[PDB]
Amino acid sequence: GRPIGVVPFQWAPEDIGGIVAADLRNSGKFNPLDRARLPQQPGSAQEVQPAAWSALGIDAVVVGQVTPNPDGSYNVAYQLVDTGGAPGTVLAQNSYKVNKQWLRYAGHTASDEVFEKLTGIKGAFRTRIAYVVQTNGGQFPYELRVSDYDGYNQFVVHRSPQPLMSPAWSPDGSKLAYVTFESGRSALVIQTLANGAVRQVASFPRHNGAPAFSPDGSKLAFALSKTGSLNLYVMDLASGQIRQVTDGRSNNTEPTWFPDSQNLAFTSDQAGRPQVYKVNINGGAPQRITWEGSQNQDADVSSDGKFMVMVSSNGGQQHIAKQDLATGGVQVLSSTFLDETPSLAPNGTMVIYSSSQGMGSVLNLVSTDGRFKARLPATDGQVKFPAWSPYL
């Protein structure tokens, strides 16, 4: 990755430089210099001595300050300093006031702005993930939770006595669709995060599952098995009208949207072993799009439509892999066991998924260039179905 210097911020209620460093490394785009190896610890743009950094192959340095305010809040400021072609030039800088609970958010804001200034890619460090935890609690063992993308600041959205599956975020980040077995069978519901209001979407006979909101906010795709097998359906969210997208006796599920809100990728057993297909929601037959491997399933298409990640079987093993949608090129990304249910960061730089790490008590992160892999912090249960929020 791109070498970069991230210096401890001048003060401590939280280690802001540590957060920036972790964020930049998580993206796979950067290789922040290990803290022990730093040549100096400048607290301001003026204290930067650019030669010590260029000597290490580093052409950008992040410095910052954290100052406490009389009202009990904190000022967090950062400055991005060029240590390459224009040594000492401030490329980017910002300063803001936050109370203690938002110090992590302050760090992620610095990460986002530094990231974007250097890569030209919008940052996703202030985003969230939704997931389901099966705890050992007896009365309500299933919880739909939300946390920051790195596992911090987790909160409970819904608790249930019965299994929950496959949460999906609305594009404005304000709602979560999910599958619940609370009534004694499957139902698809949409829950408004702010007030806890639950809208009933579908509870047809047999299975109701695998929801996905269109990027434009107008439609919800999902699968129903009422006809005798899983088929894809789309609901117009304004009216509640439902249209059948696929028909026939194969199983078609796990829909994910293309950026145009008109096409879906999805998994079908039409060819035998699961493969990924594309279909226009308005008409026409599905087209198979995965030809490499022996099995490919549970796709997520990137927000720019350039590629998709999915669970792919190659050389006998299943891992998270990425398929370029223009070239057809495929790259295996993860190396862990029992890799499943991948979900892309809204900038396409990172994938969150589930594996055997910690016997399923943790979620995993892998950068989409395959350069960096990490476990999220452990939860107090079995964690499944991660869903990466849109930009917030």
């Binding site: 099966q134 019965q162 299994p163 599956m165 496959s166 599958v179 077995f181 499957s186 047999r206 299975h207 599952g209 695998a210 699968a223 098995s225 899983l230 199983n251 599920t253 796990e254 998994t267 057993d269 699961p274 399933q297 549970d298 499943e340 249910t341 079995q382 499944k384 179905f385």
Partner: peptide
């Protein structure tokens, strides 16, 4: 218990 009955998807007996 809870399953989509596909025999293969992420919602096939996940729990």
């Amino acid at each position: 218990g809870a399953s989509d009955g596909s025999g293969w998807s992420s919602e096939n007996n996940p729990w």
